[PDB]
Design a protein around this motif. Structure first.
Motif, short mmCIF file in Angstrom:
data_model
loop_
_atom_site.label_atom_id
_atom_site.label_comp_id
_atom_site.label_asym_id
_atom_site.label_seq_id
_atom_site.Cartn_x
_atom_site.Cartn_y
_atom_site.Cartn_z
N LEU A 18 0.81 -1.20 0.00
CA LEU A 18 0.00 0.00 0.00
C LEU A 18 0.84 1.26 0.00
N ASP A 19 0.37 2.26 -0.74
CA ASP A 19 0.77 3.64 -0.57
C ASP A 19 0.52 4.00 0.87
N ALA A 20 1.38 4.88 1.41
CA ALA A 20 1.36 5.26 2.80
C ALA A 20 0.00 5.76 3.23
N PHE A 33 11.41 7.25 0.59
CA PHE A 33 10.42 8.30 0.38
C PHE A 33 10.35 8.72 -1.08
N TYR A 34 9.37 9.55 -1.41
CA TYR A 34 9.35 10.13 -2.73
C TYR A 34 8.72 11.51 -2.76
N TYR A 35 8.86 12.19 -3.89
CA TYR A 35 8.24 13.46 -4.06
C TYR A 35 6.87 13.33 -4.66
N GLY A 63 -7.40 8.66 -1.14
CA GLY A 63 -6.71 8.32 0.09
C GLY A 63 -5.22 8.16 -0.07
N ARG A 64 -4.77 7.90 -1.30
CA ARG A 64 -3.33 7.77 -1.60
C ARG A 64 -2.59 9.09 -1.42
N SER A 65 -1.30 8.99 -1.13
CA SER A 65 -0.46 10.12 -0.72
C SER A 65 -0.36 11.27 -1.73
N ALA A 66 0.37 11.06 -2.83
CA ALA A 66 0.60 12.12 -3.80
C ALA A 66 -0.65 12.43 -4.60
N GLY A 73 -4.19 4.51 -10.45
CA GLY A 73 -2.78 4.50 -10.05
C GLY A 73 -1.94 5.61 -10.69
N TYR A 74 -0.65 5.61 -10.41
CA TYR A 74 0.26 6.65 -10.89
C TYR A 74 0.32 6.71 -12.40
N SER A 75 0.45 5.56 -13.06
CA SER A 75 0.67 5.57 -14.50
C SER A 75 -0.67 5.81 -15.14
N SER A 120 7.63 6.02 1.62
CA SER A 120 7.44 4.95 0.64
C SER A 120 6.33 3.99 0.97
N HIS A 121 5.69 3.53 -0.09
CA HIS A 121 4.77 2.41 -0.03
C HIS A 121 5.34 1.28 0.84
N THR A 122 4.49 0.71 1.69
CA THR A 122 4.88 -0.42 2.52
C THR A 122 3.90 -1.56 2.36
FE LIG Z 1 2.14 6.64 -3.39
#
Ligand SMILES: [Fe+3]
Length: 329
Positions: A60-62, A92-94, A121-124, A185-187, A246-248
């Protein structure tokens, strides 16, 4: 029964999983760690199956990891993804905001724009950007989904309730909560920007590169800086919205096989890590992008003993996540 049942969110993940299973069985000795695949429609279903003891593990995303600790699920992050390199592990990421070159708007002026999120709910894709505009949203700021809805002129927010807040799925009908949804998702969020369906994709500094292999084609995109300016997409170090953890992989607090998961994953990164076995790849796939783990990962680190969700995320992110429902302005 030393076997980790990994939770695959949907048909694609499942296929990566069944071959993750298969290649590990052959390279790993008879008495080493096993993997089994449980398919579910969404991460949220994966959280509940894990707490219900029908599975053990899911990445999961944080932002989501916080959802997962919350009762009655009570899951702990247990093994972290890391980025950068093996030589220099980045935990971590930006979070950034990607846009097309020459197209008007800046951060302080995202009203009525079309937006592509990674997921609710996802971070970025959600917690960071939405949290930044929380108070500029139109009152009532509750429920959140409604307020983000009216605030843009159409969106894609995967995993949101399409039937309740229909404008958060205008850009991806159904708000599908798996890679089935191509804008998920991101992509997925980035593809949503590329195709001009949305005006901004809230993603991570790596996304654009994970999704476009030509420096020529990339000069076409820009990032939204906090000081209401724009910057080239490789300058993210200077033009990001926030740094997130980072995702854990998360797992049951009680009886969670946390030790077994580390032995699976850390043996996995040995044989099928970055440029390892030609055969199977842990951090890519023909079947899709970011399946079971982010393609942008290079390996795993063990989450320090008895660090629960609140401790992992940080004190001011956990406070951010909450006051992203309640705290007035
Ligand atoms: Fe994420």
């Amino acid at each position: 029964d030393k076997t980790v049942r990994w939770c695959a969110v949907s048909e694609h993940e499942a296929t990566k999983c069944q071959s993750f299973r298969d290649h590990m069985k052959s390279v790993i000795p008879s008495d080493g760690p096993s993997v089994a695949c449980v398919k579910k429609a969404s991460y949220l279903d994966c959280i509940r199956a894990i707490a219900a003891n029908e599975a053990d593990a899911v990445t999961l995303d944080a932002g989501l990891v916080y959802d997962a600790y919350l009762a009655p699920n009570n899951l702990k992050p247990v093994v972290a993804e890391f980025y950068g390199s093996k030589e220099d592990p980045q935990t971590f990421y930006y979070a950034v905001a990607v846009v097309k070159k020459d197209s008007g708007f800046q951060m302080n002026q995202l009203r009525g724009k079309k937006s592509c999120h990674t997921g609710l709910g996802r971070s970025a894709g959600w917690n960071i950007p939405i949290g930044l505009l929380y108070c500029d949203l139109p009152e009532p700021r509750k429920p959140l989904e409604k307020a983000v809805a009216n605030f843009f002129s159409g969106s894609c927010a995967p995993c949101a309730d399409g039937t309740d807040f229909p404008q958060l799925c205008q850009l991806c009908p159904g708000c599908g909560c798996s890679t089935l949804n191509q804008y998920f998702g991101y992509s997925g969020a980035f593809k949503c920007l590329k195709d001009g369906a949305g005006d901004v994709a809230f993603v991570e500094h790596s996304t654009i590169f994970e999704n476009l292999a030509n420096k020529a084609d990339r000069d076409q995109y820009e990032l939204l800086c906090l000081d209401n300016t724009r910057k080239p997409v490789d300058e993210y170090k200077d033009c990001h919205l926030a740094q997130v953890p980072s995702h854990t992989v998360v797992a049951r607090s009680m009886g969670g096989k946390e030790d077994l998961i580390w032995e699976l994953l850390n043996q996995a990164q040995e044989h099928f890590g970055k440029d390892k076995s030609k055969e199977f790849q842990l951090f890519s796939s023909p079947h899709g992008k970011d399946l079971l783990f982010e393609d942008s990962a290079h390996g795993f680190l063990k989450v320090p003993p008895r660090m629960d969700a609140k401790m992992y995320l940080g004190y001011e992110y956990v406070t951010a996540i909450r006051n992203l429902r309640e705290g007035t302005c």
